[PDB]
A and B are shown apart, each in its own frame.
Chain A
Amino acid sequence: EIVLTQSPGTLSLSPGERATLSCRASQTVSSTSLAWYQQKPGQAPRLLIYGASSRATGIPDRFSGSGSGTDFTLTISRLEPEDFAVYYCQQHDTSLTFGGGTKVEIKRTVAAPSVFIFPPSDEQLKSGTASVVCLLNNFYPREAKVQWKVDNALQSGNSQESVTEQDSKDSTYSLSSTLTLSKADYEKHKVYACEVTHQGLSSPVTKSFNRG
């Protein structure tokens, strides 16, 4: 069936510029059968534009839609703090399908993380398993590359990461990476290392910790 592609995947702007989002249709879609939706974090979606031009009820004038045939465009003239959300295009010309999604965030000055590390607590040493957490405090932009090392070697698979939402005040992210593994191989070594690379830093950082 008809496949809609949203480009790009993420927009990084500032509170007051102009935003343009593009939806591309595989086949030809009639202009009467396309709509746009906005979804804020933790809320339900809502209708913005229908018929590719018309505006839904109660929608501020700053939203406009246009396009035809195989290319459609949603424009926001000026960006407010409340306009940072995810936008979806829908067609119902042949069946009904949705777009991929396009998140619009805040673009600010480049910052740097605050990489830390924590040894396992003594309460986990008798449960047969342990975990070590590498932390990355307020940084920007989001994309940071983190690896774990048992003092000479790169591991994979046994590590999972959590990334927060963009901070309300300074618009920065925070990341955590947890390496969990039983105390058997944990006792086999003494020192571990977390290696972090980010666009903000001028050199990849490596923070190590030994047992003691």
Chain B
Amino acid sequence: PTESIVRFPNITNLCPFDEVFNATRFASVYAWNRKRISNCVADYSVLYNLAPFFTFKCYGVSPTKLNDLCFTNVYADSFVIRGDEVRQIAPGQTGNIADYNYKLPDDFTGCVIAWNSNKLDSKVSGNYNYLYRLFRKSNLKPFERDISTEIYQAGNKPCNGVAGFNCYFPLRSYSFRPTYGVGHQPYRVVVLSFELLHAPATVCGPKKSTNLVKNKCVNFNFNGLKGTGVLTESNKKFLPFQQFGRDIADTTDAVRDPQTLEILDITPC
């Protein structure tokens, strides 16, 4: 190899992580909020510089390598839970929150951030503003939201949509107060999910691109796909939605340039 070449999409706007973490209001756990992030540069250093009381645990990728990865989309799910239920926000976990409110898939490949919010979400006289679902007919599928309240008939006698014995209201309140322990105090939780598809990789990250060099052996990097070889002006047929081509040996052999929308063959040098 002779040269190192980096090719990333030309996007300038930065991602709005300050609007997710520093939002005045957070949602409940049975009606958790979801935001879509795309077409922006994602610098994750602002999430490391936070004080060492932000619990940060990420699955399927290391936190250090996040700045050299492109993504199709990012999803941010925000809510507030109790102190000791942060254990349940993890793949392959069960409990009252996980079964009935928020479920994570086993192949999650995403990060979870939690922090104590007792100074904001608690009130001296009682803060019943945050709810959670306690009764459900069956466990819910990953990333499914149930914003609906109807009576739960545990027994056998039906009831006229009114509570009573063996007819329960599904939702309950948290009732946070400042005079509790550490496990009974509100916690603000943000879950980041990285959606990676066969797409033009909108959410790139901080990286400057270089000029394209052909007919020479170089180190190349297209949207995080990095390797060593020679780049030839291909004459293959890609559909407008297709981004790269795979060979019989289950490894990429052709790729589209993210700045000028042309096709290139990759060959060993």
Contacts and interface: CB of A to CB of B under 8 A. Distances in A.
Interface of A: 30-33, 53
A32 B119 CA distance: 10
A39 to B, nearest CB: 25
B24 interface: yes
Contacts of A31: 120
A45 B119 CA distance: 28
B121 to A, nearest CB: 10
A21 to B, nearest CB: 22
Q: Is the interface of A mostly helix, strand, loop or mixed?
A: helix
Q: Considering the complex of A and B, which 5 residue pairs feature the smallest CB-CB distances, nearest first?
A: A32-B24, A32-B120, A33-B24, A31-B120, A30-B24
6 contacts: A30-B24, A31-B120, A32-B24, A32-B120, A33-B24, A53-B119
Interface of B: 24, 119-120
A91 to B, nearest CB: 12
A128 B119 CA distance: 70
Contacts of B119: 53
Nearest to A32: B24
A31 B119 CA distance: 9
A53 B118 CA distance: 14
Nearest to A30: B24
B186 to A, nearest CB: 13
A32 B24 CA distance: 6
Contacts of A53: 119
A53 B120 CA distance: 11
Nearest to B120: A32
Contacts of A33: 24
Contacts of B24: 30, 32-33
Nearest to A33: B24
A30 B129 CA distance: 13
A200 to B, nearest CB: 49
Nearest to B23: A32
Nearest to A92: B24
Contacts of B120: 31-32
A31 B124 CA distance: 13
A33 B119 CA distance: 13
Contacts of A30: 24
A93 B129 CA distance: 16
Most buried by B among A30, A32, A33, A53: A32
A124 to B, nearest CB: 62
A67 to B, nearest CB: 13
A31 B121 CA distance: 10
A126 B251 CA distance: 102
A31 B24 CA distance: 10
A30 B23 CA distance: 13
Nearest to B121: A32
A32 B26 CA distance: 12
A205 to B, nearest CB: 57
B144 to A, nearest CB: 30
A95 to B, nearest CB: 14
Contacts of A32: 24, 120
A30 B119 CA distance: 11
Nearest to A53: B119
A27 B120 CA distance: 18
A31 B200 CA distance: 43
Nearest to B24: A32
B67 to A, nearest CB: 25
B50 to A, nearest CB: 14
Nearest to B125: A69
Nearest to A93: B24
A53 B119 CA distance: 10
A91 B109 CA distance: 40
A167 B120 CA distance: 44
A30 to B, nearest CB: 7
B214 to A, nearest CB: 48
A30 B123 CA distance: 10
A18 B120 CA distance: 28
A52 to B, nearest CB: 10
A138 to B, nearest CB: 49
B203 to A, nearest CB: 29
B49 to A, nearest CB: 14
